[PDB]
Amino acid sequence: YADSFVIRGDEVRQIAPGQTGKIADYNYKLPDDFTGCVIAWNSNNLDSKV
Amino acid sequence: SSTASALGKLQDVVNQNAQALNTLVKQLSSNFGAISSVLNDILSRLDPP
């Protein structure tokens, strides 16, 4: 399973098992025993508009 | 009828059983290295992980 989205720079830390915040409980939750991997990369060149 | 302490064997058996039960019950009040000895305190203060 692959889940893709775009978030702010400071919220990447919230993506983790047993993590509490704003995204971590109101937008996307990961199970405590989650197995897999997470990939993040900057997109200020194309995903940011003047 | 008069002299006591002649039945020490049965009395000491009873005392041993009572002491074992008492120490087993009292062991429930120990941290064992945790932060508290009552589960609800941990379940109320700390987060799951």
UniProtKB/Swiss-Prot annotation, chain A:
Q: What is this protein called?
A: Spike protein S1
Q: Which species is this record about?
A: Severe acute respiratory syndrome coronavirus 2
Q: Give the start-end ranges of region Integrin-binding motif.
A: 8-10
- Which gene is this protein's source? S
Q: What is the effect of changing residue 50 to P?
A: In strain: Omicron/XBB.1.5, Omicron/EG.5.1
In the complete protein, the residues contained here run 396 to 445 of 1273
Superkingdom field: Viruses
- Function comment: Attaches the virion to the cell membrane by interacting with host receptor, initiating the infection. The major receptor is host ACE2. When S2/S2' has been cleaved, binding to the receptor triggers direct fusion at the cell membrane. When S2/S2' has not been cleaved, binding to the receptor results in internalization of the virus by endocytosis using host TFRC and GRM2 and leading to fusion of the virion membrane with the host endosomal membrane. Alternatively, may use NRP1/NRP2 and integrin as entry receptors.
Q: How does it assemble?
A: Binds to host ACE2. RBD also interacts with the N-linked glycan on 'Asn-90' of ACE2. Cleavage of S generates a polybasic C-terminal sequence on S1 that binds to host Neuropilin-1 (NRP1) and Neuropilin-2 (NRP2) receptors. Interacts with host integrin alpha-5/beta-1 (ITGA5:ITGB1) and with ACE2 in complex with integrin alpha-5/beta-1 (ITGA5:ITGB1). May interact via cytoplasmic c-terminus with M protein. May interact (via N-terminus) with host bilirubin and biliverdin, thereby preventing antibody binding to the SARS-CoV-2 spike NTD via an allosteric mechanism.
